[PDB]
Design a protein around this ligand. Sequence first.
Ligand SMILES: *[B@@-]1(O)O[C@H](C#N)c2ccccc21
Length: 270
Amino acid sequence: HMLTNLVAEPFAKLEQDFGGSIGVYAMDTGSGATVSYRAEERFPLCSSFKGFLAAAVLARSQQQAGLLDTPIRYGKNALVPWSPISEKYLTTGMTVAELSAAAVQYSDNAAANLLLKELGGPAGLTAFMRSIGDTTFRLDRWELELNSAIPGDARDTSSPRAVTESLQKLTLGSALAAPQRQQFVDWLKGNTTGNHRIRAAVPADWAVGDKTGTCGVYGTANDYAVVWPTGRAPIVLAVYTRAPNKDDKHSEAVIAAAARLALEGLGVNG
Ligand SMILES: *[B@@-]1(O)O[C@H](C#N)c2ccccc21
């Protein structure tokens, strides 16, 4: 508690201008200081579960040395909306590693559903998260049904705090073996969908990896990231939003602004 919110930041005004709720958790891994706002509330994961999905695949690959190289062929019926990479390889197949990279870096939905099947579905991903000590995360449904983002519905949600804690364990801690940890980091670093979210608050000369989520309803969107400022320890953070009305729009700018406030609250000069 002593190191949480040492410096207050105007998150309430930000979410009021947005017309909804913002949840933020950010950890300075050097000192343990944190910024926390609505950090234990549940928010829909949307596509942000796909980062943890890829980590779960990497964990399994530690016991199955041939897994990442395995070629997966799929039918047209696997190609749900927003499958920008897997649609280009329908007639050829893709490897497990390629599906994982597409799920992370392009938010590819067909790839995500194929990998979910490999792990035993939403309960299998949930079990992986339990295995690293995350008792908050729950995945319940598949793409695209998991994006419904219904107010008060705990299905397919986590908290900003649990997201950050699990991200730290997987990218900086010991939840993955070292080679798989760096592969997870590299996939996050190569994400293409997050340039207007946490990355927009991060100076260009710092390294960063992230995974976004966008549900398309209820003003519900999010991003989580690991950030390596030069000359100090990495920062892990999560920013989640939601809003009361089904047709409320999400805002990338609000996510970037919340990330800026989190870095300011940690005393990280940007
Ligand atoms: B997920 O939130 O990231 C993609 C985007 N934007 C996407 C598309 C369609 C459904 C879910 C998701």
